[PDB]
Design an enzyme around this catalytic site. Structure first.
Site, PDB file in Angstrom:
ATOM      1  N   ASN A  45     -31.511  31.735  22.246  1.00 44.14           N
ATOM      2  CA  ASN A  45     -30.141  31.414  21.115  1.00 44.14           C
ATOM      3  C   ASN A  45     -31.115  30.553  19.694  1.00 44.14           C
ATOM      4  OD1 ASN A  45     -29.468  30.536  23.254  1.00 44.14           O
ATOM      5  ND2 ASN A  45     -27.127  29.524  22.604  1.00 44.14           N
ATOM      6  N   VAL A  46     -30.358  30.911  18.433  1.00 42.42           N
ATOM      7  CA  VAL A  46     -30.722  29.577  17.389  1.00 42.42           C
ATOM      8  C   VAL A  46     -30.027  29.036  16.975  1.00 42.42           C
ATOM      9  CG1 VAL A  46     -32.639  28.548  15.941  1.00 42.42           C
ATOM     10  CG2 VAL A  46     -33.162  30.189  17.612  1.00 42.42           C
ATOM     11  N   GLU A  47     -28.945  28.004  16.966  1.00 37.71           N
ATOM     12  CA  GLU A  47     -27.948  27.597  16.192  1.00 37.71           C
ATOM     13  C   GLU A  47     -28.322  27.101  14.908  1.00 37.71           C
ATOM     14  OE1 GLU A  47     -25.452  25.453  18.893  1.00 37.71           O
ATOM     15  OE2 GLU A  47     -25.231  27.603  20.151  1.00 37.71           O
ATOM     16  N   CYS A  56     -28.632  35.061  17.887  1.00 34.78           N
ATOM     17  CA  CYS A  56     -28.098  34.954  18.788  1.00 34.78           C
ATOM     18  C   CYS A  56     -29.390  35.901  19.884  1.00 34.78           C
ATOM     19  CB  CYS A  56     -27.346  36.538  19.168  1.00 34.78           C
ATOM     20  SG  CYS A  56     -25.474  36.009  19.139  1.00 34.78           S
ATOM     21  N   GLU A  58     -30.614  37.837  21.923  1.00 32.87           N
ATOM     22  CA  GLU A  58     -31.245  39.138  21.486  1.00 32.87           C
ATOM     23  C   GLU A  58     -31.805  39.508  19.617  1.00 32.87           C
ATOM     24  OE1 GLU A  58     -28.179  37.901  22.732  1.00 32.87           O
ATOM     25  OE2 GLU A  58     -26.725  39.440  23.494  1.00 32.87           O
ATOM     26  N   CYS A  89     -22.683  40.041  22.450  1.00 28.28           N
ATOM     27  CA  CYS A  89     -21.711  40.290  21.947  1.00 28.28           C
ATOM     28  C   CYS A  89     -21.728  41.190  21.088  1.00 28.28           C
ATOM     29  CB  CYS A  89     -21.691  38.761  20.972  1.00 28.28           C
ATOM     30  SG  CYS A  89     -22.830  39.224  19.771  1.00 28.28           S
ATOM     31  N   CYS A  92     -24.618  42.452  18.946  1.00 30.38           N
ATOM     32  CA  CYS A  92     -25.995  41.933  19.461  1.00 30.38           C
ATOM     33  C   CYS A  92     -25.996  44.042  19.747  1.00 30.38           C
ATOM     34  CB  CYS A  92     -25.929  41.741  19.940  1.00 30.38           C
ATOM     35  SG  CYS A  92     -26.750  39.407  19.391  1.00 30.38           S
TER      36      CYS A  92
HETATM   37 ZN   LIG Z   1     -24.704  39.118  20.321  1.00 28.90          ZN
END
Ligand SMILES: [Zn+2]
Ligand SMILES: [Zn+2]
Ligand SMILES: [Zn+2]
Ligand SMILES: [Zn+2]
Lengths: 121, 119, 119, 122
Positions: A45-47, A56, A58, A89, A92
């Protein structure tokens, strides 16, 4: 010989998680998958400061899929900060479905399920 | 001391793996990280359009896969190999991972992130 | 002309309905459409961060729900009622629906989209 | 029977909202309509963008309307395409719907009414 080694995915998702960029949730996620040629790809993940622009794990794994020449997803294991499996989620799930089809296997808290059952249409 | 030509050539090469069946507008992108390594991304569309990933989204993903750092220069190209301006979304990602000093090739030449996304 | 106080109050008013349980950072926005009507939006976050809708995204939806048009002026506010800059993604939405001459209140004053998202 | 979901009403409302749809990039216009747990009808249309991934689905727009009109919980949803036929929410939208309607939210589907528990097993 030739069955999915969910353990290899688990350990690879765990190691990938080292690089997670999630300083807003402090909730690092790793993911690892087998492509139909048998290669292993990973994501994290990369926010973003703007929450809706976060990627996400994925998502990053889908990007790695195409960076490394494409193909089809066959098996995927997403992990949290404890190494436990995470359910993808809904967003994804749609990316997974497009690059895996109904037969893609996903590791979930209730064991291995298919995308046919995780995203019925 | 950015070899901008190495970036355009890298982005064009990356572009071959683009997943854009919906738009038929493939895009590639290459960037230098502050340690000198070259990363690339490609766009990956989805039947649900709002799920699509810009090539810069992929490059960011690849930034972290390969151990993080700060972006230092970036070049996005279209199917003709010409510079593309990053969209607003992609501007926020690049701001986040390179700051105001990050350099971007644009159709009209090099621009910093400070100029491209004023604060 | 544009009445900026009317937008900042309308934004703050709208911010009451904000769904921001994840950041605890509620946002409201208000804007005028080219026919003089006033529309608002609030942020709506999601357990999956990247599915969060920005205030500006909500307003854009309000624009079309209410019959279309071009945005003419926009005011985004934070929890204190201060001007907030749109994130890069929202700049691209604003540009699509207001074009280069759309005006935005910023901490530094009114700026046009052309300034805030150079093309 | 009185108080059952009127799916006709939702379908007509979604066809109606679809006229304000902004879909120049796909030419695939979508309308959606929902009953909230206080009985009010809300709607949403898709809004596309030059950057494909900044597109808002009809269900997104409707979620924004849910909060714009005071919050609450979604109770029934009907999404439509250009022919007025039932349309399945994409994955991201099933996640929004889940968050604002929970597992017992009813969605109309090409195969009849389904709940979010069925559409997004957890
Ligand atoms: Zn996701
Ligand atoms: Zn972009
Ligand atoms: Zn925004
Ligand atoms: Zn959707």
């Amino acid at each position: 010989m030739g069955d999915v080694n969910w353990d290899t995915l688990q350990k690879a998702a765990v190691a990938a998680r080292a690089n997670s960029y999630a300083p807003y949730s402090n909730f690092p996620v790793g993911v690892a998958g087998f492509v139909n040629d048998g290669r292993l790809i990973t994501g994290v993940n990369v926010e973003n400061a703007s929450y809706g622009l976060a990627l996400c794990a994925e998502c990053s794994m889908i990007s790695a899929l195409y960076a490394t020449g494409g193909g089809r997803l066959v098996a995927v294991y997403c992990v949290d900060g404890n190494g436990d499996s995470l359910m993808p989620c809904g967003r994804c799930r749609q990316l997974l479905y497009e690059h895996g089809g109904p037969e893609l296997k996903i590791m979930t808290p209730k064991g291995v399920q298919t995308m046919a059952q995780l995203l019925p249409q």
